[PDB]
């Protein structure tokens, strides 16, 4: 009430005293993922502050830094790094931001990973998203990280989407909106600034904006009804920030520019559109929080617009923060920042960007820093004290317990005929573990090893088969014939098996098609030899359509395995626990699964999921 009124006035008074260089500095958020010091031969992961990076923070007075996995490998190192970044910031504390989404996008080396957004979708309950946001937020807070670029509220209603997929809650706008809203609230309750992404909605692309500039051709009515819906709900409920999409939406803005690549005309990406960022987001939708660009180093921008140019265009469009405006990995490259600043200055001096617009943007940034307790600094503990506290919080047993429950709830049973599941092996049974990569067979193996040690199943022998880039051969059939039980993980991004007249082609010997051909070959051999067989879908669940013949089929919505003594995601263990009757899946599909054998039909509908014991829909 009065705090918000005081905050706006304080932000105004503070910005009125800043020089233009200081104001423009606040609007930049670089990364320093890697760094090459004086005397070093090439850039390496920046895990510890040095005086070279600190001097650039002091010189350019950035508003924030985005951190990547390279920068946050251990809790102890992270707390030291964020303290050191704040010590380097000469006047205003930094936003220190990160992509700790959960599931398949996480960064913290020792943090709790969580099963991810589509898993939260499968589990349905919005309180689970709140708990996820809250725990991630608590971990980030302990680490001195104050901004999370989460939640993704893109709606994955194009199954071929290669960049969103299980990063989305759902193909349904209400489920996505509800879980996005509660993620955001959980983060904010821990005083973490939360950014909705990617506006105005990246869900219906089949092109990755990392590698090319995607186009969404839907009309305004559809965009308002679907894409914009979860953004509006979270904006109305007090979203702090919104990250843009480098994606073309001609229904909102058909302005074109001459590409710097091929000289051709290209539709403006939303990030650089005044109609989208000011007309729609700011004015129509009433968002007055911080608008941050998607990363400006991505091909969707960098291919077609110059480096300085993209930053200037983004600010002209109405964004408040330019994310990763230039890549500087040594002091020899530091003028890149000076050139971005000078380009912004010229735009202000010529009136192309009124100085008042700069003031308003910096006031938003400062206001957010005050609102979330970044400014002034709240914590008077020593770094040693902060480290000790964070080591008890980040990846804590309580957090691991919560992660396990959520991952297990999310497991979605799609088929279980004649009680194929749970597997109940006799002593000495041979279990064949089949998955694309060694980390995935290792995750399944370790989980089973733990079950044996904890006397949950009888002792069994385990063999592994890693099938990425392989073609199913006699040696593989022999292993199938020798097994008593077979667990196979399937991994797809875009599910594109070759099918003719309703028949999936199993005659394909091109090893590059391994993802859609090899698991089917294992199934076929297992069924032919009357072997208990379960297929676990590991990434996008659409591959469930590749296994209509199977008697047992589950989806876990997360594919990362086990490496260096650590589970990189909880999803595979949760699925293995379900397979052996040691967890209760409660998942229902948060997307439709299109039929592969009958194109244009839905094989499994949104909301479908079985009770593993009874076979009745949940
Ligand atoms: C490991 C790593 O550094 N990845 C990043 C990208 O992050 C995404 C989330 C990933 O791991 O797949 C990053 O992608 C974009 O950039 C923003 C900042 O990281 C993200 O917040 C944003 O969500 C993401 N945009 C989309 C559409 O996913 C990318 C940008 O250069 O750099 C690495 O690939």
UniProtKB/Swiss-Prot annotation:
User: Which pathway is this protein engaged in?
Assistant: Cell wall biogenesis; peptidoglycan recycling
InterPro entries for the chain: Glyco_hydro_3_AS, Glyco_hydro_3_C, Glyco_hydro_3_C_sf, Glyco_hydro_3_N, Glyco_hydro_3_N_sf, Glycoside_hydrolase_SF, NagZ_Beta-hexosaminidase
> Which sites are catalytic?
210, 294
Q: Which superkingdom, per the lineage? A: Bacteria
Q: Where is this site: Important for catalytic activity?
A: 208
* Its EC number(s): 3.2.1.52
Q: What does this protein do?
A: Plays a role in peptidoglycan recycling by cleaving the terminal beta-1,4-linked N-acetylglucosamine (GlcNAc) from peptide-linked peptidoglycan fragments, giving rise to free GlcNAc, anhydro-N-acetylmuramic acid and anhydro-N-acetylmuramic acid-linked peptides. Cleaves muropeptides, but not peptidoglycan.
Q: What is this protein called?
A: Beta-hexosaminidase
Organism equals Bacillus subtilis (strain 168)
Encoding gene, per UniProt annotation: nagZ
